[PDB]
Paper text:
The site-specific recombinase (Int) encoded by bacteriophage λ is the archetypical member of the tyrosine recombinase family, whose members carry out such diverse functions as chromosome segregation, chromosome copy number control, gene expression, conjugative transposition, gene dissemination, and viral integration and excision. All tyrosine recombinases use the same isoenergetic phosphoryl transfer chemistry and sequential strand exchange mechanism to execute DNA rearrangements via the formation and resolution of a transient four-way DNA junction, or Holliday junction (HJ), recombination intermediate. Int is a heterobivalent DNA binding protein that binds to high affinity 'arm-type' DNA sites via its small amino-terminal domain (NTD) and more weakly to 'core-type' DNA sites, where DNA cleavage and ligation take place. The Int subunits within a recombinogenic complex bind and bridge arm- and core-type DNA sites in patterns determined by the accessory DNA bending proteins IHF, Xis, and Fis.
Using techniques described previously, we trapped and purified the multi-protein HJ complex of excisive recombination and determined its structure at 11 Å resolution using single particle electron cryo-microscopy (cryo-EM). At the center of the excisive complex an integrase tetramer is bound to a core-site HJ, where strand exchange has taken place between the B half-site of attL and the C half-site of attR. IHF heterodimers bend the P arm at the H2 site and the P' arm at the H' site, in each case re-directing the DNA back towards the Int tetramer. For P', the IHF bend is sufficient for the P'1 and P'2 arm-binding sites to be engaged by the Int subunits bound at the C' and B core sites, respectively. A sharp IHF (yellow) directed bend at the H2 site, combined with the cooperative binding and bending by three Xis molecules (gold) and the Int subunit bridging between the B' and P2 sites (magenta), redirects the P arm over the top of the Int tetramer. As a result of the IHF and Xis-induced bends, the P2 site is positioned where it can be engaged by the Int subunit bound to the B' core site. The EM structure reveals that Xis also mediates a substantial protein-protein interface between the P and P' arms. The Xis molecules bound at the X1 and X1.5 sites of the P arm are packed against the Int-B and Int-C' NTDs bound at the P'2 and P'1 sites, respectively. Instead, Xis-NTD, and possibly Xis-linker interactions provide the additional glue required to hold attL and attR together and allow the initial strand exchange to take place. The core HJ isomer that we fit in the EM structure corresponds to a bottom strand cleavage configuration, where the complex is poised to carry out strand exchange to form attP and attB products.
Residue numbers in the entry:
A (entry chain I): 2 to 97
B (entry chain J): 1 to 94
């Protein structure tokens, strides 16, 4: 699984950047994105996807184990709509 | 916040790091995440989220503009699952 460790190492052998800043950029990368989502801003990354924010209302739910119907509290989640470019590169993938 | 506005804000903060460096750095990271999902491997960033791959069974598609049945293959689709820290900070309604 791709981790921040592998991402930093990549920037070291592709951009020749020290692992230090290579590890600091990967952190600030996801950080800045999370700061935009929490602030209520859409994140549109061309050639990748789009992190949307939809306010879901309180809908009926339950306890998957027993079956006790419990109303799922409303909350703002963070969806991800992959671009057409990304889909065309993952359409022919393979779980490995 | 676009792919460009994302680099500008990060470059403004990090002054001890060339602006040009931050530009290519962001582009390489995205390309890396796009290539990983292309190979079949999944991504998992603690605190941010994770990018998995869900399978789609082949079905006789349709044309929502004309109404012609179009053949569709299996194909996979990128999926993102918000992390613990991501959901809490984003959710402004307890």
């Amino acid at each position: 699984a791709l981790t921040k460790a592998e991402m930093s190492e990549y920037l070291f052998d592709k951009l020749g950047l020290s692992k230090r800043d290579a590890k600091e950029l990967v952190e600030l990368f996801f950080e800045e994105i999370r700061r935009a989502l929490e602030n209520g801003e859409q994140v549109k990354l061309s050639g990748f996807g789009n992190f949307d924010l939809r306010d879901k209302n309180q809908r009926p739910g339950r306890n998957p184990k027993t079956g006790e119907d419990i109303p799922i509290t409303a909350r703002r989640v963070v969806t991800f709509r992959p671009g057409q470019k990304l889909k065309s590169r993952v359409e022919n993938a393979s779980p490995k | 916040m676009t792919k460009s506005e994302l680099i500008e804000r990060l470059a403004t903060q990090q002054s001890h790091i060339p602006a040009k460096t931050v530009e290519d750095a962001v582009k390489e990271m995205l390309e890396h995440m796009a290539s990983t999902l292309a190979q079949g491997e999944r991504i998992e960033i603690r605190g941010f989220g994770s990018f998995s791959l869900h399978y789609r069974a082949p079905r006789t598609g349709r044309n929502p503009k004309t109404g012609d049945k179009v053949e569709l293959e299996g194909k996979y689709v990128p999926h993102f699952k918000p992390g613990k820290e991501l959901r809490d900070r984003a959710n402004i309604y307890g």
